[PDB]
Design a protein around this motif. Structure first.
Motif, PDB file in Angstrom:
ATOM      1  N   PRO A 175     105.144  21.658  69.715  1.00 38.60           N
ATOM      2  CA  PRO A 175     105.448  20.427  69.828  1.00 38.60           C
ATOM      3  C   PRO A 175     106.595  19.851  70.222  1.00 38.60           C
ATOM      4  N   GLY A 176     106.721  18.499  70.561  1.00 32.60           N
ATOM      5  CA  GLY A 176     107.995  17.517  70.655  1.00 32.60           C
ATOM      6  C   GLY A 176     108.246  17.781  72.459  1.00 32.60           C
ATOM      7  N   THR A 177     108.008  18.689  72.891  1.00 29.07           N
ATOM      8  CA  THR A 177     107.947  19.053  74.122  1.00 29.07           C
ATOM      9  C   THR A 177     107.011  18.908  75.279  1.00 29.07           C
ATOM     10  N   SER A 178     107.133  19.165  76.870  1.00 29.11           N
ATOM     11  CA  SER A 178     106.348  19.061  78.136  1.00 29.11           C
ATOM     12  C   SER A 178     106.081  20.520  78.219  1.00 29.11           C
ATOM     13  N   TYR A 179     106.694  21.451  77.102  1.00 23.54           N
ATOM     14  CA  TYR A 179     106.169  22.794  77.349  1.00 23.54           C
ATOM     15  C   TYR A 179     104.530  23.472  77.133  1.00 23.54           C
ATOM     16  N   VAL A 180     104.294  24.324  77.766  1.00 21.50           N
ATOM     17  CA  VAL A 180     102.931  24.559  77.825  1.00 21.50           C
ATOM     18  C   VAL A 180     102.472  25.959  78.083  1.00 21.50           C
ATOM     19  N   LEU A 181     102.111  26.396  77.371  1.00 20.74           N
ATOM     20  CA  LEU A 181     102.903  28.199  76.938  1.00 20.74           C
ATOM     21  C   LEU A 181     101.862  29.284  76.842  1.00 20.74           C
ATOM     22  N   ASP A 182     101.641  30.651  76.828  1.00 20.01           N
ATOM     23  CA  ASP A 182     101.328  31.603  76.281  1.00 20.01           C
ATOM     24  C   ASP A 182     100.838  31.315  75.180  1.00 20.01           C
ATOM     25  N   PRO A 183     100.321  31.902  74.005  1.00 15.28           N
ATOM     26  CA  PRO A 183     100.260  31.775  72.689  1.00 15.28           C
ATOM     27  C   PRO A 183     102.082  31.850  72.146  1.00 15.28           C
ATOM     28  N   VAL A 184     102.056  33.712  72.929  1.00 19.74           N
ATOM     29  CA  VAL A 184     103.248  34.258  71.851  1.00 19.74           C
ATOM     30  C   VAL A 184     104.524  34.195  72.725  1.00 19.74           C
ATOM     31  N   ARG A 185     104.731  33.312  73.231  1.00 22.03           N
ATOM     32  CA  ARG A 185     105.772  32.072  73.716  1.00 22.03           C
ATOM     33  C   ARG A 185     105.603  31.196  72.921  1.00 22.03           C
ATOM     34  N   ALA A 186     105.145  30.783  72.806  1.00 20.18           N
ATOM     35  CA  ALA A 186     104.575  29.238  72.303  1.00 20.18           C
ATOM     36  C   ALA A 186     105.047  29.413  70.595  1.00 20.18           C
ATOM     37  N   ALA A 187     104.081  30.702  70.323  1.00 19.16           N
ATOM     38  CA  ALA A 187     105.052  31.243  68.769  1.00 19.16           C
ATOM     39  C   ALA A 187     106.201  31.348  68.474  1.00 19.16           C
ATOM     40  N   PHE A 188     107.106  31.614  69.503  1.00 16.44           N
ATOM     41  CA  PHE A 188     108.176  32.298  69.053  1.00 16.44           C
ATOM     42  C   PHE A 188     108.876  30.313  69.532  1.00 16.44           C
ATOM     43  N   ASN A 189     108.555  29.553  70.183  1.00 19.42           N
ATOM     44  CA  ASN A 189     108.964  28.465  70.242  1.00 19.42           C
ATOM     45  C   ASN A 189     108.876  28.004  69.070  1.00 19.42           C
ATOM     46  N   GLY A 228     110.885  27.270  76.105  1.00 21.24           N
ATOM     47  CA  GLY A 228     110.290  27.550  77.400  1.00 21.24           C
ATOM     48  C   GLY A 228     110.029  28.534  77.839  1.00 21.24           C
ATOM     49  N   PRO A 229     109.759  28.433  78.250  1.00 19.05           N
ATOM     50  CA  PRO A 229     108.488  29.728  79.143  1.00 19.05           C
ATOM     51  C   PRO A 229     110.025  30.409  79.703  1.00 19.05           C
ATOM     52  N   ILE A 230     109.547  32.116  79.580  1.00 19.27           N
ATOM     53  CA  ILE A 230     110.671  32.814  80.502  1.00 19.27           C
ATOM     54  C   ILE A 230     111.170  33.234  82.213  1.00 19.27           C
ATOM     55  N   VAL A 231     110.297  32.418  82.033  1.00 19.33           N
ATOM     56  CA  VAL A 231     110.926  31.385  84.034  1.00 19.33           C
ATOM     57  C   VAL A 231     110.246  30.086  84.201  1.00 19.33           C
ATOM     58  N   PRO A 232     110.748  28.874  84.335  1.00 15.64           N
ATOM     59  CA  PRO A 232     110.475  27.779  84.520  1.00 15.64           C
ATOM     60  C   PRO A 232     109.420  27.653  85.464  1.00 15.64           C
ATOM     61  N   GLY A 233     108.895  26.756  85.352  1.00 18.22           N
ATOM     62  CA  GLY A 233     107.537  26.179  86.219  1.00 18.22           C
ATOM     63  C   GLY A 233     106.453  27.328  85.815  1.00 18.22           C
ATOM     64  N   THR A 234     106.331  28.425  85.305  1.00 20.90           N
ATOM     65  CA  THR A 234     105.307  28.672  85.175  1.00 20.90           C
ATOM     66  C   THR A 234     104.053  27.933  84.768  1.00 20.90           C
ATOM     67  N   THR A 235     102.561  28.278  84.978  1.00 23.99           N
ATOM     68  CA  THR A 235     101.528  27.475  84.504  1.00 23.99           C
ATOM     69  C   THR A 235     100.754  29.204  84.155  1.00 23.99           C
ATOM     70  N   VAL A 236     100.471  27.933  83.077  1.00 24.68           N
ATOM     71  CA  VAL A 236      99.265  28.421  81.980  1.00 24.68           C
ATOM     72  C   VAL A 236      97.862  27.963  81.163  1.00 24.68           C
ATOM     73  N   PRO A 237      97.007  28.511  82.032  1.00 21.33           N
ATOM     74  CA  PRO A 237      95.262  28.022  82.208  1.00 21.33           C
ATOM     75  C   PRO A 237      95.518  27.617  80.281  1.00 21.33           C
ATOM     76  N   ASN A 238      94.934  26.104  79.774  1.00 24.69           N
ATOM     77  CA  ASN A 238      94.849  25.998  78.261  1.00 24.69           C
ATOM     78  C   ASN A 238      95.651  26.363  77.705  1.00 24.69           C
ATOM     79  N   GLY A 239      97.310  26.694  78.262  1.00 28.92           N
ATOM     80  CA  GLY A 239      98.490  27.059  77.211  1.00 28.92           C
ATOM     81  C   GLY A 239      98.580  26.351  75.745  1.00 28.92           C
ATOM     82  N   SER A 240      99.056  27.174  75.118  1.00 23.90           N
ATOM     83  CA  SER A 240      99.729  26.545  73.857  1.00 23.90           C
ATOM     84  C   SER A 240     100.487  25.316  73.914  1.00 23.90           C
TER      85      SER A 240
END
Lengths: 469, 472
Positions: free
Chosen positions: A69-83, A54-66
């Motif tokens: 898979p398997g989740t509703s998370y939409v993240l910056d690409p660095v964070r998504a790469a970790f996930n 998930g995001p560092i801060v719940p409810g963060t919104t990231v335009p065109n975010g990565s």
């Protein structure tokens, strides 16, 4: 003028200009893609994994975010790469490459997929063409090659450093390329990767074995994406990051030896990759698991009453997963040759649930472990490193209190070894389908399965559309 | 029972339980707070810094996000910690601590401020009480103590590693506390920091010296905050992260030696911290800069008649900043004793602009540099490490072609040394006001200045409000 270290130049040249022509690589990369994502989905069944997502801060919104898979998370690409990298590695079920260094080059998918997804969504928002799954496959081939060819002759473990440095290096190069970097940017990112963190491997070894074994590669792939992004802002590199006297990687960390690329970079690693087809477990125990499962029917009703268990193994298994006495968590157990072998003998099957406290509390396990004698067979150690073979050999024989014994059951080649590839492929697909089923409802599971196993049409699928979970 | 390494336990106990009682430490922490933020604000004048700031994805929205001073950025507390830490360190103008290890414990402010600002805004949204600037001060005191006491006896540089590990370690412990962690969470975060280990220092040395010298501490204080957050989710630690045979930090990276705390943790480091009051420049050249500036009037009209320039220095300066031949970027130059001394002689002042290509292209500089002879005075090297003194000594003398010479001008204690503190404080405030003036308009500059220097009153200010002052 400053003169960039050759290894960094060679990686850069490969990433930018080498055309991959191996059909077999692309076919295998397709298998690694589904196998890896399946492993990642299965990890969402484990709250110890999920707590880090998930995001560092719940409810963060990231335009065109990565998307993850398997989740509703939409993240910056660095964070998504970790996930993603955290998920795919978590259960010790993903692909593997073994040489002077050990590792799991599928780990690079975390950074590759996150970056390719982000780039695709941004492109789409600008009215442009997104990347396709074939671009993901090519980048996987090249990440595999970089990490795996580095692993051929450079041992990080022999200088006390974790293998994930090669994940950071491979990801940084392929991410920089995906994100539109040229030769300078890719070189500069690479140099920053070599100078960076090299994490210890304390968490992969007794007495400290723990769940950082599961997420370190995710952390390293994520870091590679981050370093690539800094490089695309024009941040400067360090031409003699490897070789600088006194202060360089080689002189500080690598005992003054040169980091070498044992062969030209192409598609050798992907073509020769190892799968964990049947069981999640540290790879060096995979064949001991197979042998244990063969023996299970001969011991299952003779159930305590076992006098001793002989396990013949190779040197890497001794260095990593040979442990006696109490095991404290699922990582400790899934990195224990004796535990894994006991599960196989006791249960005739191994699943990630067997490493949890509920199973581990079965008093039969630790009683059976204290009967086990693990010794190195030096031929197994030799054959592990020999290029035309690369066996991962174990042998298991059970002795009874009456003086009888089972046969010694030897397995050189687990089901995920290239020599057993035709036999393996259908079982890999069954593993994929089973893994998806744990998390996705019927309609979605069948749709994913169908798209992912139709390899021809899969190539041309837009990456953003493919990330349909 | 299960045996966590002693160093990690003493850090943890200090962070959780030690009450700071030093009036002097709080007073000096207040000065560090303003000085540091001033340095950060000045860094916003440098595009090579600014390019690294902001969210990863433009237009990202973060609820109750940490604000970056001087900007409109509202970020997650990890990313904010990087932004702040990058800024405050960028120009080599911030505070300094020198012993077996070198470093800049004000760097930890990146993580402390970001975390404290976040926590304040979240609290406020839950109808609770935010933290105050006094809480920030206390966490600074402790971060300074952790990094600086680690630096007393443990030399990362002797094993080829950068000093920012001790930033990561200090920030992780104070951040974990801010964020509500107990003993187990703090210990576990710390054990993950020691294992994370540990960036090289290749970017602080010839021939690779570059702008990573400016951002590595930001990257480390950010990482600390991140590791602290992971620990709050309950992510497990590694009890013998330092001592494990074969695979522990000590056996892998530290030549099998023990990491030690040379004294009990309290408020020694903050009390004895070093400021860069007048000039941005690597600290080991600060006194050479002061001596050069003294000599400037005696040489300013006779540069062509200078035959040679003698610089007597200590061992650390020889190891880091003693360079001959071409210098390639501002980081290379601000880490060059000869460059910095030449600037002082040529210009009678040193600013961050003097390290840019425009000045560096002045043909007089390199000509003067090739006349310089740097040699170690061994007594300076000894007095640099002696605890009642901790001098950072340089001496400079200029010899002319006609056979005359200036006096040899020796400076042991730069203006930022504790022995010159009373003299320094007004000059530090001036530096703060000048730094603010570069970036803020008149009304906002005056307002910030006035709140920040009214120390009694500043203490009680809510952190979120303190940060808001900088934003607009």
């Amino acid at each position: 003028m400053p003169k960039t270290d050759r290894v960094i130049e060679e990686i850069t040249d490969y990433v930018l200009e080498k055309e991959i022509t191996s059909a077999e690589a692309y076919t295998t990369a397709g298998h690694v893609l589904l196998d890896t994502l399946g492993c990642g989905i299965l990890a969402l069944r484990y709250p110890e994994c999920t707590k880090l997502l998930g995001p560092i801060v719940p409810g963060t919104t990231v335009p065109n975010g990565s998307k993850v898979p398997g989740t509703s998370y939409v993240l910056d690409p660095v964070r998504a790469a970790f996930n993603i990298g955290c998920m795919i590695r978590w259960l010790d079920y993903n692909d593997t490459w073994l040489a002077a260094e050990w590792g799991h080059p599928s780990d690079n998918l975390g950074g590759i997929l996150a970056a390719a997804d982000y780039v695709s969504r941004v492109r789409l928002s600008e009215g442009k063409e997104p990347l396709t799954v074939r671009d993901v496959l090519e980048m996987m081939i090249k990440a595999h090659e970089i990490q795996g060819v580095l692993a051929l002759e450079n041992s990080l473990n022999r200088v006390g450093l974790d293998h994930v440095l090669f994940v950071k290096v491979a990801t940084t190069a392929v991410a920089a390329k995906l994100l539109g970097g040229g030769r300078e940017e890719i070189k500069n990112a690479l140099s920053n990767a070599w100078i960076d963190n090299a994490a210890l491997r304390t968490y992969r070894h007794s007495p400290n074995t723990g769940s950082r074994k599961s997420w370190p590669a995710g952390d390293a792939t994520s870091r590679g994406v981050h370093l690539a992004l800094m490089s695309l802002k024009g941040e400067m590199g360090y031409p003699t990051a490897l070789s600088a006297p006194g202060w360089g990687f080689q002189d500080v960390l690598f005992n003054k030896k040169e980091i070498k690329l044992a062969r030209p970079l192409d598609a050798y690693v992907m073509e020769n990759v190892l799968f964990k087809v049947s069981y999640p477990a540290e790879f060096h125990a995979q064949t001991a698991a197979e042998s244990a499962v063969i023996l299970h029917p001969q011991v299952k009703n003779r159930i305590d009453e076992i006098d001793r268990v002989v396990i013949r193994t190779h040197e890497s298994a001794i260095r990593i997963i040979d442990k006696k006495g109490p095991l404290h968590n699922p990582a400790d157990r899934d990195h224990c040759l004796q535990y894994i072998t006991a599960i196989g003998l006791l249960f005739g099957d191994i699943t990630a649930q067997h490493y949890e406290a509920e199973t581990a509390n079965d008093p039969r396990i630790d009683k059976l472990r204290d009967k086990m004698e693990v010794t190195e067979n030096k031929t197994y150690t030799e054959d592990y490193l020999k290029p035309d073979k690369r066996s991962i050999s174990n042998a298991v024989q059970v002795h009874f209190k009456d003086g009888t014994s089972t046969e010694m059951v030897e397995c050189e080649f687990p089901l995920g070894h290239r020599f057993r590839r035709e036999e393996a492929v259908p079982k890999l697909l069954e593993k994929f389908s089973d893994n998806l089923k744990t998390h996705f409802p019927d309609k979605q599971h069948k749709h994913i399965y169908e798209r992912c196993t139709s390899y021809e049409t899969l190539q041309t699928m837009r990456v953003n559309e493919f990330v349909d979970m």
